[PDB]
Protein backbone atom coordinates (compact mmCIF):
# COMPACT_ATOMS: atom_id res chain seq x y z
CA UNK A 1 0.00 0.00 0.00
CA UNK A 2 2.83 2.38 0.87
CA UNK A 3 4.42 1.69 -2.52
CA UNK A 4 1.17 2.81 -4.17
CA UNK A 5 1.14 5.89 -1.93
CA UNK A 6 4.66 6.93 -2.94
CA UNK A 7 3.87 6.16 -6.59
CA UNK A 8 0.86 8.48 -6.40
CA UNK A 9 3.01 11.10 -4.66
CA UNK A 10 5.54 10.95 -7.50
CA UNK A 11 2.75 11.17 -10.08
CA UNK A 12 1.22 14.20 -8.34
CA UNK A 13 4.61 15.93 -8.08
CA UNK A 14 5.34 15.35 -11.77
CA UNK A 15 1.85 16.56 -12.73
CA UNK A 16 2.28 19.73 -10.67
CA UNK A 17 5.70 20.33 -12.23
CA UNK A 18 4.23 19.92 -15.72
CA UNK A 19 1.36 22.29 -14.91
CA UNK A 20 3.80 24.88 -13.55
CA UNK A 21 5.90 24.56 -16.70
CA UNK A 22 2.76 25.01 -18.81
CA UNK A 23 1.86 28.11 -16.77
CA UNK A 24 -1.32 27.25 -14.85
CA UNK A 25 -0.52 29.20 -11.65
CA UNK A 26 0.64 26.34 -9.44
CA UNK A 27 1.25 27.33 -5.82
CA UNK A 28 4.78 26.97 -4.46
CA UNK A 29 3.48 24.97 -1.48
CA UNK A 30 2.31 22.15 -3.75
CA UNK A 31 5.59 22.19 -5.70
CA UNK A 32 7.71 22.10 -2.53
CA UNK A 33 5.49 19.58 -0.72
CA UNK A 34 7.53 16.78 0.84
CA UNK A 35 6.59 13.11 0.94
CA UNK A 36 5.94 13.22 4.70
CA UNK A 37 3.73 16.30 4.35
CA UNK A 38 1.86 14.69 1.44
CA UNK A 39 1.24 11.54 3.49
CA UNK A 40 0.10 13.58 6.50
CA UNK A 41 -2.33 15.55 4.33
CA UNK A 42 -3.37 12.34 2.55
CA UNK A 43 -4.97 10.77 5.62
CA UNK A 44 -5.71 7.05 5.88
CA UNK A 45 -6.63 6.27 2.26
CA UNK A 46 -6.59 8.35 -0.93
CA UNK A 47 -8.98 6.20 -3.03
CA UNK A 48 -7.73 8.11 -6.11
CA UNK A 49 -10.17 10.95 -5.36
CA UNK A 50 -8.22 13.65 -3.51
CA UNK A 51 -5.97 14.05 -6.57
CA UNK A 52 -8.91 15.48 -8.54
CA UNK A 53 -8.56 19.26 -8.73
CA UNK A 54 -9.27 22.22 -11.01
CA UNK A 55 -6.59 24.69 -12.09
CA UNK A 56 -6.97 27.97 -13.98
CA UNK A 57 -4.51 29.73 -16.27
CA UNK A 58 -2.30 32.38 -14.69
CA UNK A 59 -2.82 34.93 -17.46
CA UNK A 60 -6.59 34.45 -17.88
CA UNK A 61 -8.96 33.17 -15.20
CA UNK A 62 -11.56 32.10 -17.78
CA UNK A 63 -9.47 29.19 -19.07
CA UNK A 64 -9.35 26.24 -16.67
CA UNK A 65 -8.26 22.60 -16.75
CA UNK A 66 -9.78 19.77 -14.72
CA UNK A 67 -7.74 16.71 -13.72
CA UNK A 68 -9.68 13.44 -13.48
CA UNK A 69 -8.49 10.22 -11.83
CA UNK A 70 -10.70 7.17 -12.48
CA UNK A 71 -11.45 4.96 -9.49
CA UNK A 72 -10.76 1.72 -11.39
CA UNK A 73 -8.63 0.74 -14.36
CA UNK A 74 -9.95 -0.24 -17.81
CA UNK A 75 -12.49 2.56 -18.13
CA UNK A 76 -15.41 2.17 -20.51
CA UNK A 77 -17.74 4.29 -22.63
CA UNK A 78 -19.98 5.04 -19.64
CA UNK A 79 -17.13 6.57 -17.63
CA UNK A 80 -16.08 8.76 -20.57
CA UNK A 81 -19.69 9.87 -21.09
CA UNK A 82 -19.98 10.77 -17.40
CA UNK A 83 -16.69 12.69 -17.58
CA UNK A 84 -17.75 14.68 -20.64
CA UNK A 85 -21.16 15.40 -19.10
CA UNK A 86 -19.40 16.70 -15.99
CA UNK A 87 -17.13 18.84 -18.18
CA UNK A 88 -20.15 20.27 -20.03
CA UNK A 89 -21.89 21.01 -16.73
CA UNK A 90 -18.78 22.70 -15.30
CA UNK A 91 -18.06 24.53 -18.60
CA UNK A 92 -14.41 23.51 -19.01
CA UNK A 93 -12.68 23.18 -22.38
CA UNK A 94 -9.57 21.20 -21.37
CA UNK A 95 -9.02 18.18 -19.14
CA UNK A 96 -6.19 15.78 -18.32
CA UNK A 97 -7.00 12.11 -17.69
CA UNK A 98 -4.47 9.85 -15.95
CA UNK A 99 -5.31 6.16 -16.35
CA UNK A 100 -3.65 3.01 -15.06
CA UNK A 101 -4.20 0.85 -18.16
CA UNK A 102 -4.64 1.47 -21.87
CA UNK A 103 -8.00 2.90 -22.90
CA UNK A 104 -10.74 0.88 -24.55
CA UNK A 105 -10.80 1.26 -28.36
CA UNK A 106 -14.46 2.27 -28.08
CA UNK A 107 -13.43 4.87 -25.49
CA UNK A 108 -10.67 6.09 -27.82
CA UNK A 109 -13.18 6.45 -30.66
CA UNK A 110 -15.56 8.32 -28.35
CA UNK A 111 -12.75 10.69 -27.32
CA UNK A 112 -11.74 11.28 -30.94
CA UNK A 113 -15.34 11.93 -32.02
CA UNK A 114 -15.84 14.64 -29.38
CA UNK A 115 -12.31 16.05 -29.77
CA UNK A 116 -13.61 19.04 -31.75
CA UNK A 117 -15.86 20.32 -28.96
CA UNK A 118 -13.42 19.67 -26.10
CA UNK A 119 -9.75 18.70 -25.95
CA UNK A 120 -8.90 15.59 -23.91
CA UNK A 121 -5.39 14.43 -22.99
CA UNK A 122 -4.62 10.91 -21.75
CA UNK A 123 -1.47 10.09 -19.77
CA UNK A 124 -0.34 6.71 -18.48
CA UNK A 125 0.73 6.44 -14.85
CA UNK A 126 4.04 4.85 -15.85
CA UNK A 127 4.88 7.74 -18.20
CA UNK A 128 4.56 10.29 -15.37
CA UNK A 129 7.04 8.59 -13.02
CA UNK A 130 9.98 10.59 -14.41
CA UNK A 131 9.72 14.22 -15.52
CA UNK A 132 10.62 14.35 -19.21
CA UNK A 133 11.34 18.09 -19.25
CA UNK A 134 13.90 17.91 -16.41
CA UNK A 135 16.47 15.99 -18.43
CA UNK A 136 19.96 16.87 -19.63
CA UNK A 137 19.33 15.61 -23.17
CA UNK A 138 16.08 17.56 -23.61
CA UNK A 139 16.84 21.17 -24.61
CA UNK A 140 14.79 24.23 -23.70
CA UNK A 141 11.37 24.35 -25.38
CA UNK A 142 9.47 27.63 -25.79
CA UNK A 143 5.96 27.75 -27.25
CA UNK A 144 5.43 30.60 -29.71
CA UNK A 145 2.12 32.45 -29.83
CA UNK A 146 0.15 33.38 -32.94
CA UNK A 147 1.84 36.78 -33.31
CA UNK A 148 5.32 35.30 -32.87
CA UNK A 149 4.47 32.51 -35.33
CA UNK A 150 3.32 35.08 -37.89
CA UNK A 151 6.48 37.13 -37.34
CA UNK A 152 8.63 34.02 -37.80
CA UNK A 153 6.79 33.11 -41.01
CA UNK A 154 7.12 36.64 -42.39
CA UNK A 155 10.81 37.03 -41.48
CA UNK A 156 11.94 33.94 -43.41
CA UNK A 157 9.12 34.25 -46.00
CA UNK A 158 8.23 30.57 -45.64
CA UNK A 159 5.00 28.61 -45.29
CA UNK A 160 3.83 26.50 -42.36
CA UNK A 161 4.39 23.27 -44.31
CA UNK A 162 7.97 24.30 -45.20
CA UNK A 163 9.21 23.84 -41.63
CA UNK A 164 10.67 20.92 -39.65
CA UNK A 165 7.86 18.72 -38.36
CA UNK A 166 7.20 17.23 -34.93
CA UNK A 167 4.52 14.60 -34.41
CA UNK A 168 1.75 15.06 -31.86
CA UNK A 169 2.49 11.65 -30.30
CA UNK A 170 5.95 12.88 -29.27
CA UNK A 171 6.26 13.15 -25.46
CA UNK A 172 7.25 16.83 -25.59
CA UNK A 173 4.10 17.84 -27.48
CA UNK A 174 1.84 16.06 -24.99
CA UNK A 175 3.87 17.46 -22.09
CA UNK A 176 3.32 21.02 -23.35
CA UNK A 177 -0.23 20.29 -24.54
CA UNK A 178 0.55 21.37 -28.11
CA UNK A 179 -2.22 21.22 -30.71
CA UNK A 180 -1.87 20.98 -34.47
CA UNK A 181 -0.72 24.16 -36.17
CA UNK A 182 1.56 25.53 -33.43
CA UNK A 183 5.29 26.17 -33.76
CA UNK A 184 7.92 25.91 -31.02
CA UNK A 185 11.32 27.48 -30.34
CA UNK A 186 14.28 25.27 -29.41
CA UNK A 187 17.61 26.53 -28.05
CA UNK A 188 20.55 24.14 -28.19
CA UNK A 189 23.72 24.43 -26.03
CA UNK A 190 24.04 29.35 -29.85
CA UNK A 191 21.88 28.30 -32.81
CA UNK A 192 18.09 28.02 -32.59
CA UNK A 193 15.56 26.00 -34.57
CA UNK A 194 11.79 25.77 -34.95
CA UNK A 195 9.54 22.72 -35.23
CA UNK A 196 6.02 22.63 -36.66
CA UNK A 197 3.46 20.41 -34.94
CA UNK A 198 1.61 18.23 -37.45
Amino acid sequence: TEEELKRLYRIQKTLMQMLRDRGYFIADSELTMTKQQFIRKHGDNMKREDLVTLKAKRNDNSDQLYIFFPDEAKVGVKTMKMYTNRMKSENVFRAILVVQQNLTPFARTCISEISSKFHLEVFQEAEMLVNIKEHVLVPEHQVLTTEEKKTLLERYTVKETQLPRIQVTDPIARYFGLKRGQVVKIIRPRYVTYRYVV
Binding site: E3, K6, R7, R10, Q124, A126, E127, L129, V130, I132, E134, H135, V136, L137, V138, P139, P164, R165, I166, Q167, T169, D170, P171, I172, I186, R188, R195, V198
Partner: protein, 285 residues
Protein backbone atom coordinates in the same frame (compact mmCIF):
# COMPACT_ATOMS: atom_id res chain seq x y z
CA UNK B 1 15.19 -4.79 -31.68
CA UNK B 2 14.97 -7.51 -29.03
CA UNK B 3 18.06 -6.65 -26.97
CA UNK B 4 16.87 -3.10 -26.16
CA UNK B 5 20.03 -1.91 -24.43
CA UNK B 6 19.46 0.58 -21.61
CA UNK B 7 21.72 2.96 -19.69
CA UNK B 8 21.42 3.93 -16.02
CA UNK B 9 23.54 6.48 -14.15
CA UNK B 10 24.11 6.66 -10.40
CA UNK B 11 22.88 9.62 -8.38
CA UNK B 12 25.12 12.39 -7.07
CA UNK B 13 24.37 11.89 -3.36
CA UNK B 14 26.21 8.55 -3.20
CA UNK B 15 29.63 10.24 -3.43
CA UNK B 16 29.39 11.51 0.17
CA UNK B 17 29.76 7.99 1.58
CA UNK B 18 33.16 6.33 1.22
CA UNK B 19 33.12 4.03 -1.83
CA UNK B 20 29.44 4.90 -2.19
CA UNK B 21 29.33 4.50 -5.97
CA UNK B 22 30.64 0.92 -5.92
CA UNK B 23 28.26 -0.17 -3.16
CA UNK B 24 25.30 1.48 -4.88
CA UNK B 25 26.12 -0.09 -8.24
CA UNK B 26 26.55 -3.52 -6.66
CA UNK B 27 23.25 -3.16 -4.80
CA UNK B 28 21.44 -2.11 -7.98
CA UNK B 29 22.95 -5.04 -9.89
CA UNK B 30 21.97 -7.47 -7.13
CA UNK B 31 18.40 -6.14 -6.97
CA UNK B 32 17.82 -5.87 -10.75
CA UNK B 33 19.29 -9.17 -11.97
CA UNK B 34 17.20 -12.18 -12.99
CA UNK B 35 18.19 -15.32 -11.06
CA UNK B 36 16.28 -18.45 -12.05
CA UNK B 37 15.23 -20.92 -9.37
CA UNK B 38 16.93 -23.72 -11.32
CA UNK B 39 20.32 -22.05 -10.85
CA UNK B 40 20.04 -22.45 -7.06
CA UNK B 41 18.42 -25.88 -6.72
CA UNK B 42 20.70 -28.87 -7.31
CA UNK B 43 18.54 -32.01 -6.99
CA UNK B 44 14.81 -32.09 -7.78
CA UNK B 45 12.86 -35.26 -7.01
CA UNK B 46 9.26 -36.39 -6.55
CA UNK B 47 8.43 -38.57 -3.54
CA UNK B 48 5.13 -40.39 -2.96
CA UNK B 49 4.17 -39.26 0.56
CA UNK B 50 1.17 -41.52 1.23
CA UNK B 51 -9.01 -28.86 0.80
CA UNK B 52 -7.65 -32.41 0.66
CA UNK B 53 -4.02 -32.75 -0.39
CA UNK B 54 -2.96 -34.56 -3.56
CA UNK B 55 -0.25 -37.25 -3.76
CA UNK B 56 3.13 -37.05 -5.54
CA UNK B 57 4.70 -34.34 -3.39
CA UNK B 58 7.72 -32.72 -5.04
CA UNK B 59 10.96 -32.10 -3.13
CA UNK B 60 13.54 -29.42 -3.98
CA UNK B 61 16.71 -29.99 -1.95
CA UNK B 62 18.97 -26.91 -2.03
CA UNK B 63 22.44 -26.53 -0.55
CA UNK B 64 22.96 -23.75 1.99
CA UNK B 65 26.26 -22.65 0.43
CA UNK B 66 24.51 -21.44 -2.73
CA UNK B 67 22.03 -19.44 -0.65
CA UNK B 68 24.89 -17.94 1.37
CA UNK B 69 26.72 -16.92 -1.81
CA UNK B 70 23.57 -15.37 -3.30
CA UNK B 71 22.57 -13.78 0.05
CA UNK B 72 19.17 -15.47 0.15
CA UNK B 73 17.08 -17.49 2.60
CA UNK B 74 14.64 -20.37 2.32
CA UNK B 75 11.79 -18.21 3.62
CA UNK B 76 12.62 -15.50 1.07
CA UNK B 77 12.68 -17.90 -1.89
CA UNK B 78 9.46 -19.57 -0.71
CA UNK B 79 7.77 -16.17 -0.45
CA UNK B 80 9.04 -15.22 -3.92
CA UNK B 81 7.71 -18.49 -5.37
CA UNK B 82 4.30 -17.93 -3.77
CA UNK B 83 4.17 -14.33 -4.99
CA UNK B 84 5.08 -15.32 -8.55
CA UNK B 85 2.55 -18.17 -8.51
CA UNK B 86 -0.17 -15.76 -7.37
CA UNK B 87 1.02 -13.00 -9.73
CA UNK B 88 0.17 -14.56 -13.12
CA UNK B 89 -1.28 -18.08 -12.64
CA UNK B 90 -1.90 -18.16 -16.40
CA UNK B 91 -0.14 -21.48 -17.03
CA UNK B 92 -0.80 -24.77 -15.19
CA UNK B 93 -4.16 -25.55 -16.82
CA UNK B 94 -5.18 -28.19 -14.29
CA UNK B 95 -6.48 -28.57 -10.72
CA UNK B 96 -3.98 -26.31 -8.96
CA UNK B 97 -6.62 -24.19 -7.19
CA UNK B 98 -4.35 -24.18 -4.13
CA UNK B 99 -0.55 -24.47 -4.07
CA UNK B 100 1.28 -24.30 -0.73
CA UNK B 101 5.05 -24.51 -0.24
CA UNK B 102 6.57 -25.65 3.06
CA UNK B 103 10.16 -25.29 4.27
CA UNK B 104 11.89 -28.01 6.30
CA UNK B 105 15.52 -28.05 7.41
CA UNK B 106 15.64 -31.87 7.46
CA UNK B 107 13.38 -34.18 5.45
CA UNK B 108 12.56 -37.86 5.98
CA UNK B 109 14.35 -38.96 2.81
CA UNK B 110 16.51 -42.08 3.18
CA UNK B 111 17.29 -42.39 -0.54
CA UNK B 112 20.53 -40.42 -0.24
CA UNK B 113 22.46 -38.56 2.46
CA UNK B 114 25.41 -37.19 0.48
CA UNK B 115 24.80 -33.60 1.67
CA UNK B 116 24.05 -32.85 5.32
CA UNK B 117 23.88 -29.03 5.09
CA UNK B 118 21.23 -28.85 2.35
CA UNK B 119 17.78 -27.39 3.04
CA UNK B 120 14.80 -29.13 1.45
CA UNK B 121 11.88 -27.21 -0.09
CA UNK B 122 8.56 -29.07 -0.16
CA UNK B 123 5.92 -28.26 -2.78
CA UNK B 124 2.48 -29.83 -2.33
CA UNK B 125 -0.28 -29.77 -4.95
CA UNK B 126 -3.89 -29.45 -3.78
CA UNK B 127 -6.80 -30.94 -5.74
CA UNK B 128 -10.44 -29.88 -5.41
CA UNK B 129 -11.73 -33.31 -4.34
CA UNK B 130 -10.65 -34.87 -7.64
CA UNK B 131 -8.04 -37.30 -8.94
CA UNK B 132 -7.26 -35.39 -12.14
CA UNK B 133 -3.71 -34.74 -10.86
CA UNK B 134 -3.06 -38.34 -9.78
CA UNK B 135 -0.75 -38.98 -12.75
CA UNK B 136 2.97 -38.24 -12.65
CA UNK B 137 3.57 -37.32 -16.30
CA UNK B 138 1.37 -34.20 -16.18
CA UNK B 139 3.01 -32.71 -13.08
CA UNK B 140 6.51 -33.75 -14.20
CA UNK B 141 6.05 -32.09 -17.60
CA UNK B 142 4.15 -28.94 -16.51
CA UNK B 143 4.79 -27.96 -12.88
CA UNK B 144 8.49 -28.83 -12.67
CA UNK B 145 9.48 -26.67 -15.69
CA UNK B 146 7.26 -23.87 -14.36
CA UNK B 147 9.02 -23.70 -10.99
CA UNK B 148 12.53 -23.88 -12.46
CA UNK B 149 11.81 -20.94 -14.79
CA UNK B 150 10.50 -18.79 -11.92
CA UNK B 151 13.07 -16.10 -11.02
CA UNK B 152 13.70 -15.75 -7.29
CA UNK B 153 15.45 -12.38 -7.79
CA UNK B 154 15.08 -9.46 -10.14
CA UNK B 155 12.44 -9.27 -12.86
CA UNK B 156 11.57 -11.46 -15.83
CA UNK B 157 12.11 -8.56 -18.23
CA UNK B 158 15.74 -7.87 -17.33
CA UNK B 159 18.17 -10.27 -19.01
CA UNK B 160 21.56 -9.21 -17.62
CA UNK B 161 23.19 -6.17 -16.02
CA UNK B 162 26.90 -5.35 -16.26
CA UNK B 163 28.93 -2.61 -14.59
CA UNK B 164 31.05 -0.49 -16.94
CA UNK B 165 33.38 2.49 -16.66
CA UNK B 166 33.34 5.40 -19.11
CA UNK B 167 34.99 8.79 -19.56
CA UNK B 168 32.79 10.42 -22.26
CA UNK B 169 29.16 9.61 -21.40
CA UNK B 170 26.38 10.26 -23.90
CA UNK B 171 24.56 12.41 -21.32
CA UNK B 172 27.00 14.85 -19.67
CA UNK B 173 26.32 16.21 -16.20
CA UNK B 174 25.30 19.84 -15.77
CA UNK B 175 27.97 20.86 -13.24
CA UNK B 176 30.98 19.12 -11.72
CA UNK B 177 32.70 18.38 -15.04
CA UNK B 178 36.02 18.11 -13.18
CA UNK B 179 35.16 14.46 -12.43
CA UNK B 180 37.06 12.64 -15.19
CA UNK B 181 35.46 9.22 -15.54
CA UNK B 182 32.22 8.04 -13.95
CA UNK B 183 30.60 4.65 -13.37
CA UNK B 184 27.28 3.59 -14.90
CA UNK B 185 25.25 0.42 -15.41
CA UNK B 186 24.08 -1.10 -18.69
CA UNK B 187 20.83 -3.08 -18.64
CA UNK B 188 19.64 -5.52 -21.32
CA UNK B 189 15.98 -6.55 -21.32
CA UNK B 190 14.14 -9.34 -23.12
CA UNK B 191 11.97 -8.44 -26.08
CA UNK B 192 9.76 -11.53 -26.14
CA UNK B 193 6.54 -9.48 -25.85
CA UNK B 194 6.16 -6.20 -27.73
CA UNK B 195 2.88 -5.24 -26.07
CA UNK B 196 4.62 -3.25 -23.31
CA UNK B 197 7.61 -0.96 -23.71
CA UNK B 198 10.84 -2.11 -22.08
CA UNK B 199 11.42 1.30 -20.49
CA UNK B 200 7.91 1.23 -18.99
CA UNK B 201 8.61 -2.12 -17.33
CA UNK B 202 12.05 -0.92 -16.20
CA UNK B 203 10.53 2.11 -14.46
CA UNK B 204 8.11 -0.09 -12.51
CA UNK B 205 10.86 -2.44 -11.30
CA UNK B 206 12.95 0.46 -9.95
CA UNK B 207 10.31 1.88 -7.58
CA UNK B 208 12.13 0.84 -4.35
CA UNK B 209 15.39 2.28 -5.72
CA UNK B 210 14.14 5.41 -7.49
CA UNK B 211 16.43 7.66 -5.43
CA UNK B 212 19.58 5.63 -6.16
CA UNK B 213 19.19 5.80 -9.95
CA UNK B 214 19.77 9.25 -11.44
CA UNK B 215 16.84 9.59 -13.85
CA UNK B 216 18.00 13.01 -15.05
CA UNK B 217 20.63 11.41 -17.31
CA UNK B 218 19.40 7.83 -17.79
CA UNK B 219 18.21 7.14 -21.33
CA UNK B 220 17.71 4.09 -23.56
CA UNK B 221 20.62 3.21 -25.83
CA UNK B 222 18.31 2.69 -28.81
CA UNK B 223 17.64 5.49 -31.29
CA UNK B 224 14.27 4.61 -32.83
CA UNK B 225 12.20 4.46 -29.63
CA UNK B 226 14.20 7.07 -27.71
CA UNK B 227 12.28 9.79 -29.56
CA UNK B 228 9.02 8.37 -28.18
CA UNK B 229 10.39 8.60 -24.61
CA UNK B 230 12.52 11.76 -24.43
CA UNK B 231 11.54 13.57 -27.64
CA UNK B 232 13.07 13.92 -31.08
CA UNK B 233 15.86 16.22 -29.86
CA UNK B 234 17.24 13.68 -27.37
CA UNK B 235 17.25 10.99 -30.05
CA UNK B 236 19.03 13.37 -32.42
CA UNK B 237 21.68 14.14 -29.79
CA UNK B 238 22.25 10.45 -29.06
CA UNK B 239 22.46 9.76 -32.80
CA UNK B 240 25.07 12.52 -33.17
CA UNK B 241 27.08 11.07 -30.29
CA UNK B 242 26.94 7.57 -31.77
CA UNK B 243 27.95 8.89 -35.20
CA UNK B 244 30.91 10.72 -33.67
CA UNK B 245 31.93 7.54 -31.84
CA UNK B 246 31.69 5.53 -35.07
CA UNK B 247 33.77 8.11 -36.95
CA UNK B 248 36.40 8.06 -34.20
CA UNK B 249 36.50 4.25 -34.29
CA UNK B 250 36.89 4.36 -38.09
CA UNK B 251 40.08 6.39 -37.60
CA UNK B 252 39.06 9.23 -39.93
CA UNK B 253 38.46 12.88 -39.06
CA UNK B 254 35.11 14.44 -40.01
CA UNK B 255 33.92 17.96 -39.25
CA UNK B 256 30.95 18.51 -36.96
CA UNK B 257 28.75 20.29 -39.50
CA UNK B 258 28.53 17.23 -41.77
CA UNK B 259 27.28 15.02 -38.93
CA UNK B 260 24.85 17.71 -37.76
CA UNK B 261 23.48 18.06 -41.30
CA UNK B 262 23.07 14.28 -41.55
CA UNK B 263 21.21 14.21 -38.23
CA UNK B 264 18.93 17.09 -39.24
CA UNK B 265 18.21 15.53 -42.65
CA UNK B 266 17.38 12.10 -41.19
CA UNK B 267 14.97 13.64 -38.63
CA UNK B 268 13.20 16.37 -40.61
CA UNK B 269 9.73 14.78 -40.33
CA UNK B 270 9.92 14.19 -36.56
CA UNK B 271 11.06 10.57 -36.86
CA UNK B 272 14.25 8.78 -37.92
CA UNK B 273 13.31 7.11 -41.19
CA UNK B 274 15.28 4.17 -42.55
CA UNK B 275 17.65 4.38 -45.51
CA UNK B 276 15.52 1.94 -47.53
CA UNK B 277 12.94 2.89 -50.15
CA UNK B 278 10.08 2.68 -47.64
CA UNK B 279 11.63 5.32 -45.40
CA UNK B 280 12.18 7.76 -48.26
CA UNK B 281 8.64 7.15 -49.54
CA UNK B 282 7.19 7.80 -46.08
CA UNK B 283 9.28 10.96 -45.71
CA UNK B 284 8.03 12.25 -49.07
CA UNK B 285 4.44 11.33 -48.18
Amino acid sequence: QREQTMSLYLSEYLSKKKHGFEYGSLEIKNHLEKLSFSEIVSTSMIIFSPVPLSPWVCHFHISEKVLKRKQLSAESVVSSLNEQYKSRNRELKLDIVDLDIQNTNHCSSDDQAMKDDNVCITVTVVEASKHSVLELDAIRLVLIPFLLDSPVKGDQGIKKVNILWTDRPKAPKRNGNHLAGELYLKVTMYGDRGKRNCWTALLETCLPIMDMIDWGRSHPDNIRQCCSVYGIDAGRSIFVANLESAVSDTGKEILREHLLLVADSLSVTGEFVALNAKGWSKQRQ
